[PDB]
Ligand binder design. Structure first.
Ligand code: VBA
Ligand code: ZN
Lengths: 403, 311, 41
């Protein structure tokens, strides 16, 4: 209709993220007639993106997502106007004024922290926000509107790790801590960690009354012993060797990245030795990659469905039909009423929201700046955050805890 | 093991979803897709990214001036090109691992032996006669058959997988689901007291489909927004006659339905194309229960409904 | 006094007698259906 079409032709929209959801969404907005789009993504293209981020081909690996996405779209519709940022949305330059330019913001993000930031920015700028998320076969869409709707935020112990691990993940988390401790001579580290420390650990006699004791490993002793390559579980000797090999490659502040072969090999080997020591079956590098990297399994069709819904919701917003917007869940199997997609009316702001309520306050019983104000309460440039135009009053009453 | 190390790395995130064996099954499968308009373009993209052995994109029509100015697989300025040919370069480059081919001949003229090279056939923009005819061919040769279409804010998918066996994670449990010929699916008898009860719970989108397929049979084309007044009037008449024919009240389909069922809307193509390609993926890999047998999408209400209709 | 069943997004049927969001016939709780919010994209 003439009114919607002119809004779609006139206004400027922001897409935060050029991945699974974002590629699909960028295409859908263009084809729907959205004539002014800003696209931001901080990342470059990886080979594993190519099953579902359809604007990127193999030759593009290593380039910026947002820039390639624009180049790809312009090849099928040159008169698209798109501005691409190879940047993070949490950059203070994307301030309330920047956000104020857009008649609609759409998230295409993969983590809660970034969404929390965009939520505040959109509240502050008083621009509607379509929020969305996927994982495997599942996903959802909703509309966030200040004054009208709920906002996005309206709703292992060291001892298990260091002393009494009982599951593969504890060894994996341990291997990650170990990587940071060292990087965040192989034979000497190997014996210290896998022989000595497990002896020092057999000193604490109380612990091993109940559960099965660890068995120390000696370097020289160990040296004397269908599916994809990575899905194979190797023997102890192999991991011991890998551990060595990876330390070699690593020495030649680092942040752990699942995609760095050496760092990944490190954590795999370490965790597998630790697993062997505590009488657990060792795990394939494929499996350890999942668990250590927190890999979300992901495909084309789910993101494509969700990105289609996003635009339909945007059209309702821009047609002044927000009452007609919904939260839509994408199921794998139909509910009892045969609904594969489950729409629900939007909920009003929660009066006791720590974020979007009139004068928010909370009670907590450099650790404050980082692990509370920044981490727990998602502030970025901090209790004020003039970027997020948000003030939170903290009442001071397991390090800390929120009542 | 059965796939290269380049394939392993590229398909990594979906191998983590449906398993390597599922992927190997897709790797072995060849799909025929008919119609390279909005919905076919989405299905084509999804199946190609997924890594089928091959996709044959069949369309005998040319890009027209009415066609969208932006189409994600076709360059601007291809008015007069055959639509599949105009789609090939971009489709292929989505995934060089896939053998993407093009067929410019009318699906109606295809001999029964054309279909045997395919594990699955997916029709879009096809007439009811053609839909029935190809479903009958597929049944004979045990070929996975699908259809789907978008019209305005609505869209649908259909499957006939015959007797379909699959595994599902409860440990993987083998299960079986039985589907019916598309002819039965499209010609339900609403006479029965059983069928009378079923009607109460059936989405009106099913009757929308009936109206739109008859328009297609009558007019050789779909309604178009360029001929909105002309097509709206005819639709309202087809509504009357089709529903009267079924002993069903015309008023089951609201009279303003005409407002919501014109043209290809790209977001509706994406939703319907997503569900349909995934049904194809499920069917080829024999993993997870396929929808038996209709999915009906309404982009105004945000509804997606699976109906079992026919038996 | 009431025979109720909560089905999760994975069809996980479990029974009851008396991270998640709860629904009955499309109305937030305040067969039941449970929906998680996904954070991928
Ligand atoms: N779903 S997907 O992976 O296919 O695509 C998701 C894309 C989202 C892009 N991320 C992005 N883009 C723009 N601005 C910010 C971000 C962030 O994700 C971001 C920046 C800072 N943070 C906080 C953070 C830091 C470290 C760990 C966790 C969270 N998040 C992403 O590149 C994909 O292309
Ligand atoms: Zn809130």
């Amino acid at each position: 209709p003439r009114e919607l079409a002119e809004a779609v032709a006139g206004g400027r929209v922001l897409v935060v993220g050029a991945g699974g959801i974002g590629c699909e969404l960028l295409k859908n907005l263009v084809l729907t007639g959205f004539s002014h789009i800003d696209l931001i993504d901080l990342d470059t293209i990886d080979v594993s993106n190519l099953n579902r981020q359809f604007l990127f081909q193999k030759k593009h690996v290593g380039r910026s997502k947002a820039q390639v996405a624009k180049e790809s779209v312009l090849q099928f519709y040159p008169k698209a106007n798109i501005v691409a940022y190879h940047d993070s949305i949490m950059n203070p330059d994307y301030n309330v004024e920047f956000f104020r330019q857009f008649i609609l913001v759409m998230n295409a993000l993969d983590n809660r922290a970034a969404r929390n930031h965009v939520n505040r920015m959109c509240l502050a700028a008083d621009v509607p926000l379509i929020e969305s998320g996927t994982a495997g076969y599942l996903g959802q869409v909703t509309t966030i509107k200040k004054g009208v709707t709920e906002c996005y935020e309206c709703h292992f112990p060291g001892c298990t790790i260091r002393n009494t691990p009982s599951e593969p993940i504890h060894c994996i988390v341990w291997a990650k801590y170990l990587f940071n401790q060292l990087f965040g001579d192989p034979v000497k580290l190997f014996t210290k960690l896998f022989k000595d420390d497990i002896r020092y650990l057999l000193t604490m006699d109380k612990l091993w009354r109940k559960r099965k004791p660890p068995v120390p490993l000696d370097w020289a002793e160990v040296q004397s012993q269908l599916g994809l390559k990575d899905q194979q579980v190797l023997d102890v000797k192999s991991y011991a060797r890998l551990f060595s090999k990876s330390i070699e490659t690593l020495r030649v502040e680092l942040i752990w990245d699942k995609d760095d072969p050496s760092a990944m090999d490190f954590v795999t080997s370490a965790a597998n030795l630790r697993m062997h020591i505590f009488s657990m079956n060792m795990k394939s590098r494929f499996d350890i990659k999942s668990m250590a990297g927190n890999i979300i399994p992901a495909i084309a069709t789910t993101n494509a469905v969700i990105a289609g819904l996003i635009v339909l919701e945007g059209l309702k917003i821009l047609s002044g039909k927000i009452d007609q917007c919904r939260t839509i869940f994408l199921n794998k199997q139909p509910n009892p009423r045969k609904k594969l997609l489950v729409p629900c009316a939007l909920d009003p702001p929660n009066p006791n929201c720590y974020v979007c309520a009139s004068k928010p306050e909370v009670t907590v019983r450099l650790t404050l700046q980082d692990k509370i104000v920044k981490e727990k309460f998602a502030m970025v440039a901090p209790a004020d955050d003039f970027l997020q135009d948000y003030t939170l009053l903290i009442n001071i009453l397991v390090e800390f805890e929120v009542v | 093991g059965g796939i290269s190390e380049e394939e392993a790395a590229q398909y990594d995130r979906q191998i983590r979803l449906w398993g390597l064996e599922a992927q190997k099954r897709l790797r072995a499968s060849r799909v025929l897709l008919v119609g390279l308009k909005g919905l076919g373009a989405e299905i084509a993209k999804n199946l190609i990214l997924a890594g089928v052995k091959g996709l044959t994109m069949l369309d005998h029509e040319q890009v027209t001036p009415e066609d969208p100015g932006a189409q994600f697989l076709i360059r601007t300025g291809s008015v007069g090109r055959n639509r599949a040919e105009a789609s090939l370069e971009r489709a292929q480059n989505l995934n060089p691992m896939v053998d993407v081919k093009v067929d410019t001949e009318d699906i109606e003229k295809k001999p029964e032996s054309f279909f045997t090279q395919f594990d699955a056939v997916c029709l879009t923009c096809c007439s009811r006669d053609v839909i029935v005819k190809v479903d009958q061919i597929c049944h004979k040769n045990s070929i996975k058959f699908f259809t789907g279409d978008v019209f305005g804010y609505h869209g649908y998918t259909f499957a006939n997988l015959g007797e379909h066996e699959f595994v599902e994670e409860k440990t993987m449990v083998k299960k079986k689901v039985v589907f019916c010929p598309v002819k039965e699916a499209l010609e339900v008898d609403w006479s029965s007291e059983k069928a009378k009860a079923a009607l109460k719970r059936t989405t009106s989108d099913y009757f929308l489909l009936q109206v739109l397929l008859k328009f297609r049979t009558d007019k050789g084309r779909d309604p178009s927004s360029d001929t909105y007044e002309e097509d709206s009037e005819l639709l309202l008449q087809i509504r009357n006659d089709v529903l009267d024919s079924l002993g069903i009240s015309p008023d089951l389909l609201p009279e303003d339905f005409v407002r919501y069922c014109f043209s290809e809307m790209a977001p509706v193509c994406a939703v319907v194309g997503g569900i349909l390609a995934q049904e194809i993926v499920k069917a080829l890999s024999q993993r997870d229960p396929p929808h038996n047998n209709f999915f009906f999408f309404d982009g105004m209400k945000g509804n997606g409904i699976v109906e079992c209709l026919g038996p | 006094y009431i025979k109720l069943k909560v089905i999760g997004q994975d069809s996980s049927e479990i029974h009851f007698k008396v991270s998640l969001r709860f629904l009955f016939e499309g109305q937030r709780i305040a067969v039941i259906e449970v929906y998680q919010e996904q954070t991928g994209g």
